[PDB]
């Protein structure tokens with residue numbers, strides 16, 4: 001009544017069941033880890049879930065068990081569900097397949113941006129999404145947890161039904177934070193390489209140790225991307241990425257240069273970088289001081305850029321915390337509806 005293919009995926013398709021409770025009604029994508037299927041939960045109101053079905057492969061089974069354990073601790077600290085994390089509704093071991101059920105939500109903030117032709121979110125939408133992202137991660141950070149992999153693809157709209165205006169505009173900017181697979185408690189082993197390239201802070205690139213400030217850097221990057229529709233750091237190499245940071249944000253703190261094992265990036269305390277090369281000319285022409293990317297010069301825009309610069313502080317010990325970010329004057333622009 002159950003089988004696996006040669007990769008250890010669960011053989012299944014639309015119409016199948018699990019646990020005499022989940023009825024598979026759609027495909028939501030695959031990965032190295034296994035499958036995600038849209039299911040009706042017949043033990044709820046035939047309510048829609050995303051069900052992640054992990055391969056019958058040791059290393060994926062164990063990675064899923066650690067993710068479940070994280071999701072269980074978040075749940076215990078947020079019973080009331082106030083801090084805007086994607087809801088884990090159930091989990092089970094199905095013949096060696098770890099299965100995790102989540103509340104089905106709408107498009108991720110990246111898919112929505114792509115489908116609007118990368119035309120940026122209006123500032124009031126950036127502000128509401130920023131506020132929820134700060135609120136969600138502040139709660140995790142105060143419970144000794146770092147996400148480590150915040151990116152637009154991991155931030156979901158609760159409903160992504162949009163109005164078309166003379167541009168697509170999402171009707172409701174309520175979001176949830178997903179993908180706790182890499183989340184790390186203060187007392188746990190911190191792996192060396194965290195965050196996706198574009199969202200990765202200097203203290204991770206220089207391997208100087210990381211903690212909650214890692215997520216604040218990622219959020220600064222994400223807010224830039226919501227505001228302009230393109231990524232702040234478009235590079236796949238550490239030495240170029242640090243040069244881009246310097247051109248956009250100012251000089252790297254000399255104590256971070258002194259402490260890094262990666263001395264090869266530096267000569268007499270300066271980044272090794274040939275301004276005259278092809279790559280040199282490209283970075284010169286495309287990576288300007290952060291303020292030069294504002295679209296308007298009214299207060300609301302100035303306030304976003306001031307908050308964003310404090311989220312992109314090189315030194316993680318000087319970087320704004322999310323408890324501080326939530327008091328920033330940028331958030332006075334929220335409606336009384338958004339602010340709760």
Ligand SMILES: Cn1c2c(c3ccc(Cl)c(Cl)c31)[C@H](C#N)C1(CCNCC1)NC2=O
Nearest residue numbers: 028036050052102103104105106107108156
């Ligand atoms: C909860 N959820 C959702 C998606 C997932 C894709 C993969 C995984 Cl592992 C999960 Cl949990 C997903 C998709 C994205 N991003 C969609 C699937 C339904 N249509 C909109 C995107 N929404 C989710 O709630």
